[model samples]
Target: PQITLWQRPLVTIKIGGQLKEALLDTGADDTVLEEMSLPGRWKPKMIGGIGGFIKVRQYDQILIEICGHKAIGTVLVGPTPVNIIGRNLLTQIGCTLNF
Candidate 1:
């Protein structure tokens, strides 16, 4: 068996009455949520993307579940083109790099 590396794990999420799927990225260190897919209690937070070390603040919290484990953390909100399960969740799960 190959060791898990580079993250990119696939997962499912339940928002409102809808169930969605997303890719988990261990490379990311923040919880990046889809603008349109954000769930309840998820406040809006300001965050800067790559290139320039932009500042990030104001964010929301959502219940994130993975393989039976779950946690609530600050999630990034912005005009992201796609939904991303950032590293925050991945670190909680586990991380490993393979050659």
Candidate 2:
């Protein structure tokens, strides 16, 4: 199926058996989610955002479904204002850009 790129590029995704909305941020390099409790050991990492740099928990190999496309990848959890789906998970679903 073909997905159109919208200004917001919002999509619904399933994570941890819960449904959540996320933005398809091509400008971002990694997927980031709002603060949530997740099982597993997460490594401490500092990430740069539009506002400023913040510390986050980096979780690996989490199951996520976006637009029917399922993939396992890394997701950073912290004080993210919004959920963002970045290139890390986008590429796995064969999403390419057209200028």
Candidate with top lDDT is: 2
Writing each residue's lDDT as its tens digit, candidate 1 over 1-92 gives 23364565566765444566766665566766455555455444445466534443335556666554566665675545455667776676
RMSD of every prediction: 4.1, 1.4
TM-score of each: 0.58, 0.90
lDDT of each: 0.57, 0.89
Q: How much is 86 displaced in model 1, in angstroms?
A: 1.6
Worst 10 residues of 2 by lDDT: 1-10
Off by over 4 Å in 1: 1-8, 37-61
Residue-wise lDDT of candidate 2 within 34-93, one digit each (tens)?
988777999988988788888889999999998878999999997777899999999999
TM-score leader: 2
Model 2 clash pairs?
none
